[PDB]
Structure formats: structure tokens, C-alpha cells
Amino acid sequence: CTLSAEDKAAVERSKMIDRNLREDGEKAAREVKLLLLGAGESGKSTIVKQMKTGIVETHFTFKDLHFKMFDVGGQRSERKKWIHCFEGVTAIIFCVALSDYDLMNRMHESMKLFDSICNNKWFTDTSIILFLNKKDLFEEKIKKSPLTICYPEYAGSNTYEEAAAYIQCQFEDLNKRKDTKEIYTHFTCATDTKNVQFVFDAVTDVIIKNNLKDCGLF
Amino acid sequence: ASIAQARKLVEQLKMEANIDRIKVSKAAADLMAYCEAHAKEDPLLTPVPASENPFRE
Amino acid sequence: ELDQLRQEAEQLKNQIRDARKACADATLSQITNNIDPVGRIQMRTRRTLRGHLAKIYAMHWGTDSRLLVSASQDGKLIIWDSYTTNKVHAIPLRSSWVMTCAYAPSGNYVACGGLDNICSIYNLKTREGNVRVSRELAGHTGYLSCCRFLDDNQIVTSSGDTTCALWDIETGQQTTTFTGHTGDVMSLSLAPDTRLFVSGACDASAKLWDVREGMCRQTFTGHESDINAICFFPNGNAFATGSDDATCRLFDLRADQELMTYSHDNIICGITSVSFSKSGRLLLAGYDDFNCNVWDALKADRAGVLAGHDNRVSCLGVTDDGMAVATGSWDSFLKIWN
Amino acid sequence: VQLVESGGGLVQPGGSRKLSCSASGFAFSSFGMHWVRQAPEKGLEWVAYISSGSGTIYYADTVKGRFTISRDDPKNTLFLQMTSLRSEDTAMYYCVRSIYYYGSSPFDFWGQGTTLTVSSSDIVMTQATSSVPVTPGESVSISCRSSKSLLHSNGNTYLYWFLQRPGQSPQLLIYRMSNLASGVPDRFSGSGSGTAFTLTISRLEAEDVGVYYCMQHLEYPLTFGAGTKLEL
Amino acid sequence: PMKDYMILSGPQKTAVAVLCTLLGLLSALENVAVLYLILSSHQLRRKPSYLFIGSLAGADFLASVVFACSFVNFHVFHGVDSKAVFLLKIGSVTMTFTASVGSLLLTAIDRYLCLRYPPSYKALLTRGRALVTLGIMWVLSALVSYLPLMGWTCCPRPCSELFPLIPNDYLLSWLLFIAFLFSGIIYTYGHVLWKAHQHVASLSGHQMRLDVRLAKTLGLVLAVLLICWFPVLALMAHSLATTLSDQVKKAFAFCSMLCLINSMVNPVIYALRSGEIRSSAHHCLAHWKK
Ligand SMILES: CC(C)CN1C(=O)CN(Cc2ccc(-c3ccc(F)c(CNC4CCOCC4)n3)cc2)C1=O
């Protein structure tokens, strides 16, 4: 065999390490990664509390699905030099503060970040589970002040039903890859308890579509 | 406040402006001399047979 | 006065450029045309390494030129035997977002770091059979981009918080910090004598620091985009930088100006890794076009392609004896070329 | 790191026994364990070897089929089930810790041992020096010769040196040709010619008195050498 | 001497000789191109589903060539061959077609696993398991398809009339085997559609596209398969109970060539529908133009 006793034993140790690697990789592949790029103070921590250093890992399960949320907003550096690390993440959870449309404008900063990360060359096929946080604050605020301060081209009604829909359409008009990715939108607040469920269905739809694309059905 | 960084740049440029400099000809000659001196010891520039090559499968 | 000091700095920069121009009597391309071309370099994949399941982001050779450490995003740090493709150790990292890895010259310690803002040093040799973490270094406010070992007790680090740090492993403190960079520091290279070291940041500039003083001796502004990779010359008086504008440049430490530009029109993608071979004649650069080029450090003519990777060649390194070149790629495949 | 062992006793011949080696202080699963005998007046002799994950189990020709070695990784213990105990199995069974990778140090730690006293084609290594005296502070070169060359095609010479102080468990000194083990003073040095080997020690104190055993790990069975005693 | 068996040899066989050979050559070309694309991209090979698609393509390519040659030799050349080699062609063509049907079922099961276990699909059905199931179905088809000659000589029971010296009980057994295969295909596709409908209903429970798209694609892949394979099996089952006194043999030949039409329609329906195969074809065309 031209191999020594120690060489053969080292080969066996390498095979055992390979088996442990395969087991850990299968366990990791059973899990779901969810990058969480919020627009700063746009209700990022509220959703994290609702589902339960530099980068914070949040682990939670729901219907026997091990999720992993990565809060990377604390990096405070150039995003281009490490945003490729998250390439291949299952879905980006974007948090936008609806009440931040009066603060240039904070909602415009959120829109700029959404445009920057949605049209990035890494997340072309990575879908976005968009979150429009603080819908109660939006409903309260829309009566004292109008949306004209933030959106100058807006000319619709004033009620929350139309204004929130207009904001959602504006955020959903930013994806130039309307075919290879889909934006899942949900209007959440501090009292909602179904946000984790909505994340579950959005993630399972994303995984189903990815599998169908990989299996040739699409 | 920003004047601190402003003049710190000036002291840094003072320090990096008084260093001695050799010409490009001499530096290139030294680089070339080192490249030529150790050419025989380079297993990549100078290929070696399979006898002493540890990567032969 | 603020503007008066800014004008003084501008005049100083013009004077520095004038000194460099006065030193620029000739150029390397005009002085190394009579030398014989290196000839076409044909390297074959001797060992391809299987066992990583995600994107490999860093690698470092051991001093003995037989062992190496590979870092990937799956959260594991496999120590490889290059001569026979075995796994000596598999290190489960606390954070799976690793971006750098370094093998100590002694070999007893390996270090990894990434987005977790922590440089984790792992004790390879211990009377337990484990690779338990020896020390976790904290103090960086940005992502850690490069790790390099001075000795078993000191490790230098490049981070994204516009600074570099020289740590003391036994006490886990900040001995000296190197400030002066405007953008994120992406890679550092250590001189063979370990007296000085360079660092390529994202401000299209590479600096040269005195490790024992913390001061910046020299600043090299030659590129137009971010500098991703850097590597010292084997002699110790030159260093090549791999930028994002698909160009590599050879700077020198005694004329403080660029010596040579490694550019080609057919290449429009940035450089992830750069490292000279032994004798410094060949410049092995990994690109984002699933490719690794081999350049002649004295002639602009390219030596040869090193294709064979299905994704971006994230990192590459040459052995201490120069016998082999190992390249890591984002396709979860280490490849060693001779 | 310790390996305490249980077993032994006055077994009538032909009975059965189950020696146990409970390991505490290290990653037991990653270490390929070993068993070594020692007759009251004879040298070491290899018994069995169970690797990591129990993938490969080896036995000596004198105990093959009769003995049975196994490990309980979760319980951190090592078992050696014995049957039909002859009167020639009376020995001091040792539990040897061994790991196997590049640059590793096999046979690192040895256990206390059990006094099991049952009532009533391999590479042979010869140690010519049965017993040599020494003046404390001089240099001696223990030389033992092998049968076939231990120099493999990979450039590794598989020769191990073990020191056994009086009334103590063996301790690893040099785990290959000129590779000092951890915790061993630098005075211990070894070098061989591929078939004949020597172990040279510069300065001697009361720590060096004992018996030095040279062993080969090129192939199984793991043949040891005879006793080489150093007397003050 | 067997002229009494080949039903038609006269004014009508002029068209079929060109027709079946043209369909066979086109199907073979398409399938060869498909399998070359699968095996050349060096990335679809690692993905377990496209290896199943390529296995279907190869089985159907063998089907096209074997059926084309056998039919032009039988219903045009009227070639009478030795039973050892004459029933070998029966066994081989049966093996190819049963392998094609089994590959259809295996892709159907892969697509079912894409929905029943979304998150675990990638790691549950891996590369090695993919070839394991591939070889299992291939050898099962080979055995159940070459048993007609090596196993049964139809000496105790009368041999088939619509099929040359083939045991009638083997006819019934293989027809039941293919009926089970098609029932499995329909069952897994129906479960796929039901899972998609339930999932879209659950997703739209707070805020139809997926189930409609799946309905369209699976409806094509199922309707074409039915109108290409059900007629010939139905004609066979009719022949189980009749004596073919009424003219059904040239009609059976027509059904056979329309079943061969499934051979050319399989690539476009399954592999060309996939975006990855289309992109790989475009890249290969660009490389060839280079
Ligand atoms: C040399 C010979 C090959 C040429 N040859 C003849 O000798 C007779 N013939 C007419 C024919 C037509 C279609 C099919 C067929 C079509 C589809 C199909 F799936 C099968 C499966 N096979 C089974 C069918 C049940 O029973 C046993 C054989 N079979 C089989 C035969 C013919 O092509």
C-alpha cells in the first residue's frame, strides 16, 4: 500500500474530520440565513424582539425551521468590502420606519439604502422580505401632517390605507430585477405577533422558488 | 477640532518629506540583481524534475 | 489657521512629488528590456483540496511549506497537509464570518478574524488533543481584514476602522496602534525581517509603518481604486499591491514611487490576492474573473494563466521554499499549483 | 491528563477479565488508544490498538481472537475484554494515549497500569546493552538494532524511545528519529542509520536512571526492545 | 415468410418510412445536444436534478435510435431475424422506454421533494443519492425489460399476437408496471399542485401566481405525456382481449410513431424549459462562435 501505520491512521483521522464536516454542513444547510439590513433606527430591534461585537447572530425556530438572522448594522464601515460575505443568504429582511417620513428625509435615506442593497450585484437573485415598521405611528401621524412633506409628487388621499400603499409601491418600484427576485412586504407594529409567521411563509416561498429554479421547473 | 488632524497631516508630511531617496535606476538595479541571484533557487521560474518535487501525486 | 495649514500640506505634497520626479531618472521597463524573458510559465494543479463547504476567504502557508490553514465562511478552519491531502485539524470558529487567517512561524498557533471584530488565536499544540482558543483579541471598532504573525507572542492586524493594531497575545492588549489611513485597511504584508510592514487601504494608497515605533515612514499613492491585496518583495525593499482597477503596481521602499504597473486591457476585474514567488521574479495575482495570472516582476509581459477555478480566487499564497502555489477560491475548492 | 486503570487480580487460568482505562483531561475520542503488557522481569509487548471512532482494531498474534478491545467514547473509558487467560498473560497492562496526524506525538501519555497475575515475521529490535553503568554527569549512547529498515518512503524513521524510571510508568522521550517529546529536557537526543539507532544523552542526573525501550511503529505488531538499564 | 404479420406494405407505407426516420433523427439530435450541454457545463453535473434530466435525455435518445432502426427494419424492410436477436431488440427498446418513464417519475419525485421539504431539499437529495436512485431505476428497468426473452419462452401459455412471440402474461405484467409508473407520476404531480395551492393560500392569508405557473407547466408535461403514451398502452390492453381481427395493426404503428413524437417533445418540454439549460446553451453558442 506504500503507506505507513501513522500515515494510514492520519488518513483515517482525515476521513473522520471529513465526516464531521459533512454532518455539520448538512445541519447548516438544514438552516436558513436571513440578513437584516435595516435603515438604522428603522425599527430593527423591534422585529428582533418580536421573533423571540460587530455582527449579531439571532437564532430562532418556527415550525421546525432553524433561522439565523444577522444584524450587521453595527459594522460602521464600507459595505462594499464585506457585503459579498452574505451573498447566498436566503432573504434580506429590510426594516423601514413608516413614521420616519418626517425625519435629508429619513424615509429618503431608507429608500436610498433599499436601492443600494436591492440592486447590488450580489443580491440580484436574493429576495427581500421588506418590513414597514411602526404602522400605528404612521396611522397616528398621517392626520396631523400630510405625506406631501416627504413625497412631493403624491396627490392621492390622506387616509392611512392609501398612503401606506403608496409608500409600499414606491419601495417596490426600486427593484430593477422584477423577474429574478420578489419583494415581500408586510405592515408590522410593536403589538403584532404574526411577523415571525409572515417571515416563515416568505422564507418558505423563497426556498420553494429557489428549489424549483434549481430543479429546472422554471 | 479638525485643526488637530489638519496639522497632524502637516507633521506627518514633514516627516515623510525629509527621508533620503535613492534613484529609480539604483533601486531597479538592486531589484534585478536580487531577481537574478536567486533564480536558480526558484522552483517556479526554474522548473524542477519529479525527483525532488514533493507535489507529484 | 486651518486653511493655512491645508495650504502648507498641499505645498508639502507638491514638494514630495517633485522629489520623486527628480529621483525618476529612468524606469524599470526601460532598464529590464535586455534581460531574457522568463518564458511561458505552465503550472498544473497537483493537489486540489476537498472539505470546505462554503466560500473560502483566506489561506496561509506554514513555515515548513507542508502545512497550511484555510478559512471559509462555513465556520471551520481546516489545517491542511499539502503533500498528502489530509486534514490535521478542523477548527469550529465561534463566528462563521471569517475573512483572514494566519499561520504562526513557529506553527503552534493559528489566528482567524472577520466581521466579529475579534482576532481569535487557536493553540494548535496542547496536551489535550483540542485546538481550544488561546486568546480572543478585542479593541477593533471595524471588521478585521488581515492577520499576520510577528512571533508566537505578537500578531499584527488590519481592520476596517482605518487603523492597524500590533497586539500582545499573552496579555491581549494594544501595544501600538497605527493611525493615518482614510479608508478601510484591506490587507497587510510583513517584511522578512519583521521590522517594518505595509498596509493597503481603500483610499487607493499603501503605507509603510515602523512596527517598533508606530509611526508611518512612507506613503504610496499610486492606484485609483481600493487596494485589496499587498505583498512584500522577498528582498524586503519592495511591495506589490493588488487594486480594484484590475492593475497591480510594484512600489519601492527607497525611491518612494511606483516602479512598474501590471495592467492589461483584457482584464477589467479587480485583484483579490497578490504574492511573489521565491526570488520575486513572478507575481501571482488572483482576480475576480475566476482566474489567477502570473506576471513578470521585471517585464510587463505576462508569464501565464493559472485557470481552473469555478469562482473568484479569493486568496493565494506561495510556499517558503517556492515549490508550490496554493490558491483559494469562492467555489469551496483549494488548489495547489507547481 | 491522567489514565487510571482498573482490573487485575488472582484469576484462575482459563477464566475471563475486562480491564478498564478511564480517561480524564483530554479529548479521548480523538486519541487512538493502545494497550501494552509488561511481564514482571521482561520488557514491553504490544497488545491491541483501537483508533478514533473504532474504525480499525488491531491485536497482537499472542492475543488475537482471544482478546477483545473496545472503547466507550461518551463514557471516557477503554475496555479490554479477555478470555481463556493463560498463565503467560501475567503482566502489567498499560493504557497508552496516542494521536495520529502530521507532526503528532504518538504514545504521549501512559497510564498507571494494572497488576494482572493469572495463577497456575515482525521487525525484531535487539538492545545489545542489557545493562551499563554510568558516572552521574557523563554521556551514554543507548544503541538498539532493528531487523528491517524503519526508514519509510515518506522520509520518516519510525523509532520511539521510552524511559521507565524505577517503580514508574514509561514516559515518551523521542517520538521519531531526532524528535524530542514535550516536557523532555534538551539533553536527550537520538539519531539512527535506518536500521541501527542510538540515543545519546549529554549530562545525567538521578532522573535518567531506569530502562530505555526502543519501539518501531512502521507496521503492526508493534515490537518493542529488551530492557536497557542504567545503574548509578 | 412473415408477410402475414406486417399488416401494410403498399401505397401507404411510403410516408411512414420518411416520417419515423425523420422523427428519430431529430429526437436523437436534440437529446444528444441536451446531454452534451448537461455534461459539458461542469456545473449542472453537480446539481442532482439536471443529472436526472440528462438521464431522461439519454434514455430517450437510445429510445429514438433503437425504435427508429427497429421500425424501419420491421415495417419497411420486413426483416425476419433470429429469435435470440429479434427479441433482443424488443427487450432493448422496452428498456429505453421504461427507463424514460422511470426518469420522468424520478424528476417528478425530485420536484415533489422541492415542495414537500423546501428547506431540506438540497441536502436530503444529494449527488451520491441521486446516482444511487438513478442506477437503481436503470437496473430495475433493464431487468424487467430483458426478462421477456431470457425469462419466459411462452411455451406453456400462448404467445402474443400483436407482439412477435412475446408471452401474453409478460404483456400484462409490463402493462401493469407502466400503469403503476404513470399512476405514480400523476399522484406525485397532483401532490405537487396541492402543496403549491395550499402554500399560496397560506401566504396570501394576510397580504396564486405559483400554483397557476406550476399548473401550466405540469399540465403541459402531463397532457403531452398522456396523449403520447396512454393511446399505445390502451391499444395494447385492447389487444389483450381481442384477436386483432379488425384492422388495428397499422393504427398501432401510427400510435407507435406518435409515441416516438414524445421523444422529440421531451427535450423542449423538460430541459429547454429550464432557464439554466437555456443560459448554458447561449454561453456554449457564444464560445463556439469565439
Ligand atoms: C425488432 C423489433 C424491436 C421491431 N418491432 C417488432 O418486431 C414489432 N414492433 C411493433 C412495436 C411497436 C411498438 C412497441 C413498443 C412501444 C412502446 C413501448 F413502451 C414498448 C414496450 N415494449 C413492451 C410492450 C409490452 O409488450 C412487451 C414489449 N413497445 C413494440 C413493438 C416493432 O417495432
Author numbering:
A (entry chain A): 3 to 54, 182 to 232, 240 to 354
B (entry chain C): 7 to 63
C (entry chain B): 3 to 340
D (entry chain S): 2 to 121, 124 to 235
E (entry chain R): 21 to 227, 237 to 319
What does the paper say about this structure?
LEI-102 had a high binding affinity for CB2R (pKi = 8.0 ± 0.1) and was more potent than the selective CB2R agonists APD371 and HU308. A clear electron density in the orthosteric ligand binding pocket in the LEI-102-CB2R-Gi complex resulted in the unambiguously defined binding pose of LEI-102. LEI-102 predominantly interacted with the residues in the binding pocket via hydrophobic interactions. The isobutyl substituent of LEI-102 showed interactions with residues S902.60 (Ballesteros-Weinstein numbering in superscript), F1063.25, K1093.28, and I1103.29 in CB2R. The imidazolidine-2,4-dione formed a π-π interaction with F942.64 and showed further hydrophobic interactions with F1063.25 and P184ECL2. The benzyl formed an aromatic interaction with F183ECL2, and hydrophobic interactions with F872.57 and S2857.39. The phenyl ring in the core of LEI-102 formed a cation–π interaction with F183ECL2 and T-shaped π-π interaction with F2817.35. The pyridine had hydrophobic contacts with F1173.36 and W2586.48. The aminotetrahydropyran sidechain protruded into the long channel and formed hydrophobic interactions with residues I1103.29, T1143.33, I186ECL2, Y1905.39, L1915.40, W1945.43, and M2656.55. Additionally, a hydrogen bond was formed with T1143.33.
